[PDB]
Amino acid sequence: HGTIDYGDVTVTGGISVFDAKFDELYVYDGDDLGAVYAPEETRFRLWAPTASEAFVVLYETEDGMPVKELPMKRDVQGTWTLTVAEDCGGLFYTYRVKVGEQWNEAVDPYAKAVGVNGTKTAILDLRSTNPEGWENDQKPPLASPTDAVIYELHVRDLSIHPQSGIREKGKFLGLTEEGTRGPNGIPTGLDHITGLGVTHVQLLPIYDYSQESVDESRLDEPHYNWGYDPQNYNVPEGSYSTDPHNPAARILELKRLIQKLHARGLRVIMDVVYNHVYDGYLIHFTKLVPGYYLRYKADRTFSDGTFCGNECASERPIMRKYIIESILHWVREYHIDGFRFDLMGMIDIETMNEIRRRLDEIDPTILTIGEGWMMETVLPKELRANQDNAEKLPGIGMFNDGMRDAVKGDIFIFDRKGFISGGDGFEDGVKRGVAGGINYGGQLRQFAVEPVQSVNYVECHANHTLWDKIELSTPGASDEERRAMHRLASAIVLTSQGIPFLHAGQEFMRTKGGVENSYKSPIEVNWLDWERCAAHQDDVSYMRSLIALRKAHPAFRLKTADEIRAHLRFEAAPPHTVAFTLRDHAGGDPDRHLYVLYNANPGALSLELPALGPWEVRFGGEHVLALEAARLEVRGVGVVVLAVPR
Ligand SMILES: OC[C@H]1O[C@H](O[C@H]2[C@H](O)[C@@H](O)[C@@H](O)O[C@@H]2CO)[C@H](O)[C@@H](O)[C@@H]1O
Numbered sequence: 292h293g294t295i296d297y298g299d300v301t302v303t304g305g306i307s308v309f310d311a312k313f314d315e316l317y318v319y320d321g322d323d324l325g326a327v328y329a330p331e332e333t334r335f336r337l338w339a340p341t342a343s344e345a346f347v348v349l350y351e352t353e354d355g356m357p358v359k360e361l362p363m364k365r366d367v368q369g370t371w372t373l374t375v376a377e378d379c380g381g382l383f384y385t386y387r388v389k390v391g392e393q394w395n396e397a398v399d400p401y402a403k404a405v406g407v408n409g410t411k412t413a414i415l416d417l418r419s420t421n422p423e424g425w426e427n428d429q430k431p432p433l434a435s436p437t438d439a440v441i442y443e444l445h446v447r448d449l450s451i452h453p454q455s456g457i458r459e460k461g462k463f464l465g466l467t468e469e470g471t472r473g474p475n476g477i478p479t480g481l482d483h484i485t486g487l488g489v490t491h492v493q494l495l496p497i498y499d500y501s502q503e504s505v506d507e508s509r510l511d512e513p514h515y516n517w518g519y520d521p522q523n524y525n526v527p528e529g530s531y532s533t534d535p536h537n538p539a540a541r542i543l544e545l546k547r548l549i550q551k552l553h554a555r556g557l558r559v560i561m562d563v564v565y566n567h568v569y570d571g572y573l574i575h576f577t578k579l580v581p582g583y584y585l586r587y588k589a590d591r592t593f594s595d596g597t598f599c600g601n602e603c604a605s606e607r608p609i610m611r612k613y614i615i616e617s618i619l620h621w622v623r624e625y626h627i628d629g630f631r632f633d634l635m636g637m638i639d640i641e642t643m644n645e646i647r648r649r650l651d652e653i654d655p656t657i658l659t660i661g662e663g664w665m666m667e668t669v670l671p672k673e674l675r676a677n678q679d680n681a682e683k684l685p686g687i688g689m690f691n692d693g694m695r696d697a698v699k700g701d702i703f704i705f706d707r708k709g710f711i712s713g714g715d716g717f718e719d720g721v722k723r724g725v726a727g728g729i730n731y732g733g734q735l736r737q738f739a740v741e742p743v744q745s746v747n748y749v750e751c752h753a754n755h756t757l758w759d760k761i762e763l764s765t766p767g768a769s770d771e772e773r774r775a776m777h778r779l780a781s782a783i784v785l786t787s788q789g790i791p792f793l794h795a796g797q798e799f800m801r802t803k804g805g806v807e808n809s810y811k812s813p814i815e816v817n818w819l820d821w822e823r824c825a826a827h828q829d830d831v832s833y834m835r836s837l838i839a840l841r842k843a844h845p846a847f848r849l850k851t852a853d854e855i856r857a858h859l860r861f862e863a864a865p866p867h868t869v870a871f872t873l874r875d876h877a878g879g880d881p882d883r884h885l886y887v888l889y890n891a892n893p894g895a896l897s898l899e900l901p902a903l904g905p906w907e908v909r910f911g912g913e914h915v916l917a918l919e920a921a922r923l924e925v926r927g928v929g930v931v932v933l934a935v936p937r
Pocket residue numbers: 517518519520564567597599633634753808810
């Protein structure tokens with residue numbers, strides 16, 4: 292890149308953008324940043340306190356020359372304003388500012404529609420993008436975060452396989468198509484997903500990500516990217532629409548997607564990346580108010596805790612404002628039902644709690660989960676929204692990595708075994724996740740105050756898939772033996788307290804051919820392979836059965852830590868097993884008691900059962916040789932569930 296000029300210090304009373312004092316000036320509190328369109332007129336408002344001049348630049352085409360360049364009026368609390376008294380429909384615009392001696396041109400940070408590749412703001416009456424009946428759109432019910440079953444999905448993965456039977460492959464609208472068939476007539480797409488019994492689809496980045504990741508003008512050529520490279524936070528990604536050149540198309544089709552998912556009983560969680568931008572020098576934030584929206588060390592270099600080049604300065608009030616209004620826009624405009632915060636440890640506690648509060652005033656059933664890893668940054672340690680500070684983040688879920696590693700083995704040392712694959716000493720790790728990560732007792736405690744704070748998982752888009760990790764850590768084993776370990780791991784997720792999270796394709800043992808980090812690998816690596824799905828319908832049914840077992844038993848879904856400490860009991864069990872009971876109608880369970888065995892021992896075992904009444908088999912009967920008087924005779928790797936009826 293070229294030159295960054297942080298401003299003529301006399302424009303802001305001698306106070307530099309880097310000064311702590313700066314945060315108390317220009318604290319704009321209005322609701323109208325960006326552009327408000329109507330046929331009569333359009334009103335623009337930009338926050339640019341360090342600029343000495345500011346212009347609205349109008350274009351007639353997404354690539355044309357400027358047709359108009361209009362000065363803005365210096366307004367209150369650091370903002371500039373303009374009213375254009377023409378019908379601006381179908382126009383495009385940018386802002387041009389002078390900061391120091393530099394002139395910079397930039398998309399509106401509050402852009403709601405953009406041209407192709409997102410380099411100009413597009414002026415649009417967004418009510419014209421609503422699908423028919425949008426006002427009647429109703430959410431499926433959701434009584435507790437522990438009642439969710441999350442399915443993590445990438446819009447391109449879903450349909451791009453050539454046998455997916457979906458017409459609009461790789462597009463938002465691909466996930467609206469019903470009755471789509473794959474190899475040998477199996478259901479694919481939305482019908483496959485609703486068939487599973489999952490409750491929430493969690494979509495990898497659907498905000499507009501950088502042209503460097505996917506070029507929206509060359510979709511006739513191979514392309515793929517997860518999209519963790521944010522460019523326009525409040526507009527949908529162009530490559531997922533049928534026409535990235537038509538500003539309304541991506542907006543209307545995302546809404547048609549969310550509407551259809553809601554009609555079929557599914558809620559939508561948005562993966563959201565407010566911790567960094569695609570390029571800190573070129574982003575509109577830096578062109579318009581250089582030095583303010585991103586984090587700097589003391590020597591004026593970017594803080595780089597993300598390893599992505601930059602960090603967003605969430606703790607500065609105007610950025611905090613920006614992030615909250617961004618969240619609220621996706622709620623209000625697109626009816627989103629949840630957010631998954633990438634590297635949430637980079638966001639400050641105040642911001643996250645304020646997000647939780649604002650969403651609670653709208654609808655407390657909107658989910659908030661995140662990656663609360665402990666990671667270094669210029670943000671002081673006591674302000675980071677991570678696992679160490681979970682007790683200051685009521686209501687916010689975090690991925691439980693201790694559970695993940697204990698179950699399937701270490702994700703960074705590929706060959707190391709975990710509980711499912713016969714490693715030694717992982718039983719307590721598994722037990723801590725069964726209890727929902729809470730301070731259960733003794734050495735059985737993790738970071739969670741309440742079970743709604745723990746997301747259990749054994750696979751996601753990142754790192755090896757569960758099947759690929761098992762293969763790298765079980766060199767002796769057969770494919771039969773590996774499938775049993777895979778199934779055991781899914782069963783542990785779906786019978787642990789907290790919030791179960793599944794990766795799309797885990798139900799048919801999704802593989803990436805051993806690729807560990809597939810963020811820009813081709814579609815051949817990354818697609819949902821509906822051929823493999825057709826060959827694994829038994830495994831798919833097993834997963835659907837696990838999901839229905841969790842839905843049938845509120846004891847697996849307790850809401851509070853007090854309930855878990857009162858109803859969950861760990862039983863004596865030999866090495867390479869975990870056994871526990873959920874006693875006395877836990878959480879309203881129909882049965883009097885439940886007994887769960889996680890058995891990673893391949894041979895025959897004779898187990899003592901607690902004397903709680905006449906046990907009977909409810910799941911895993913294929914592993915049970917007998918159920919006597921009181922003892923259980925078992926062979927095989929897998930989960931067994933017993934119950935004492937009412
Ligand atoms: O932006 C490119 C970037 O994408 C991925 O990094 C993600 C990762 O998937 C997230 O779960 C989390 O760890 O943060 C990153 C986004 O902030 C790739 O892993 C990475 O190689 C790549 O550079």
